[PDB]
Design a protein around this ligand. Sequence first.
Ligand SMILES: O=C(CN1Cc2ccc(Cl)cc2[C@H](C(=O)Nc2cncc3ccccc23)C1)NC1CC1
Ligand SMILES: [Cl-]
Lengths: 296, 305
Amino acid sequence: SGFRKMAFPSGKVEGCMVQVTCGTTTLNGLWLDDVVYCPRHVINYEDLLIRKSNHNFLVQAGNVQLRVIGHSMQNCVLKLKVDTANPKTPKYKFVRIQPGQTFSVLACYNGSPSGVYQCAMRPNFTIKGSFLNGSCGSVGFNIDYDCVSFCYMHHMELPTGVHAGTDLEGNFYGPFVDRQTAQAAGTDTTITVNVLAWLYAAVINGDRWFLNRFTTTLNDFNLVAMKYNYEPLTQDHVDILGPLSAQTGIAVLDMCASLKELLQNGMNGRTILGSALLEDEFTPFDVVRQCSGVTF
Amino acid sequence: SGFRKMAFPSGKVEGCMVQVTCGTTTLNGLWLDDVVYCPRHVICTSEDMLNPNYEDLLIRKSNHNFLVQAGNVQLRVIGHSMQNCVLKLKVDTANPKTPKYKFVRIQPGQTFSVLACYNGSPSGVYQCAMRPNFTIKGSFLNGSCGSVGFNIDYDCVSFCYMHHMELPTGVHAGTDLEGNFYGPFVDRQTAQAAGTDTTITVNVLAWLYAAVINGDRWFLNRFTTTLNDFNLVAMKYNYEPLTQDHVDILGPLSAQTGIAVLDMCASLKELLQNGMNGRTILGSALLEDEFTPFDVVRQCSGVTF
Ligand SMILES: O=C(CN1Cc2ccc(Cl)cc2[C@H](C(=O)Nc2cncc3ccccc23)C1)NC1CC1
Ligand SMILES: [Cl-]
């Protein structure tokens, strides 16, 4: 029993965190094999980079100084070729995630991991994270068996306190650029498929007060959801919720009729899984993994 | 900016997780140096759980009855002893990944990270607090027994909890690493229930100071309160009594924001009376109590917004 926001074990990622210093700027880097990946703002980026030599970049892995032997740029990410391969390099892939997908964040300062937390890529491409100055280069990841899938690298904080960053190939999530300008996060929406998954997790944990005898159509549900700034629910979302629907005996459009009633009437002093708000940072797969016991 | 429930990086603890099998039971163990620590109920059948005599069950076992697995490698048990509700298995190999560590017993209200495991394999990490009723609201399934709670302040791992059982309400009970249970619980399948839980007042206050640090003051008022009057109101909402120690502990956060502890206590009184009226505090519609004054100072900036 119990339902917590759970992050993946961070150990395989801790063994890759390094400190990168270029002049007066100090941020975090990801050391995989003989390459260190970090935000390019550590340094017209081609004009700034052409003026630098390998020794201008100071890379620290624990107490050991790594020697930079080459450097190149890929989108908004700087790739520093080092003389030593990381002996703690795990099996890994670079993956780009979609909004609504969740991931673990290992928050670092001066190449030292300080905390781990779980979060989701919002529909507006921002992440509601917890980062202070020096956190740049902290990474987001998922684990599938023994393989680490790197999906995010922190670049900046927006004026509303939310965060923006890139995939590990330097491509930003959202319409953001890596520089000081007037940029704001778009209006956010609720990840509907995630709220439904969390309602199924509540039923699995013995919370059924919100269930009713009604069912609805996908069209009618989307007309109501659009009015409460909820993401449209697609047929793919309904298919993805199939296993949870079969496990609890509550059809997806049966659970949508419960969500519609919670949206129009509220919770009325009651909570779901200890929460007074409808939770959207647990995907269908997270619910199945936390209520099954998948290990790494 | 931002305020998340943050767990400590789990790597130092992952390198200590092993699988312990005794007969038909399989649970998790903590391998530190040449000793593997695990719940003593690993020597029990489901039948034994009603009235188990652990001394009688243990005297009938030999070293080769305990199977310990560290990854793909089988560890050989060379000794065994019981310390309260934990079984200590002496192994022939010291753990090369043993970090710097201490065994610490925590008090209710204290927080810690939990590395949830099954078959000696870590599957997830989360942050939680020791409730005033000595239970933990965790997320554990069958096979999680032996999963551990810890803090990693500086480079040292402080082990404070080992999971032993789930109570009928879905909450969890366990011991410190010396086998002493937190709360009036026994590793016996007995009619035992968690006492009425209360809100950790000093933690809610700390979290209200964290909201003021991150720029939110809508909940503040012009009133103050005596400590006694605050506790008379707090007891009516099932909040833990706030002691003079709690007020002293909140000293640095009070000095950083310019809001006296008893003035923040007055805001808490008013929040309990009125609710949030459609507003949230740090993205929450409920008053949060699983962040200590020490966690707030650790996570939040030193400069107030
Ligand atoms: O199904 C049982 C059998 N349990 C009896 C029992 C009695 C005393 C002691 Cl110390 C341990 C135990 C085990 C125990 O409580 N294990 C577990 C731990 N953590 C989370 C769980 C989640 C689901 C199932 C078992 C869990 C086995 N009871 C549980 C109340 C559902
Ligand atoms: Cl303590």
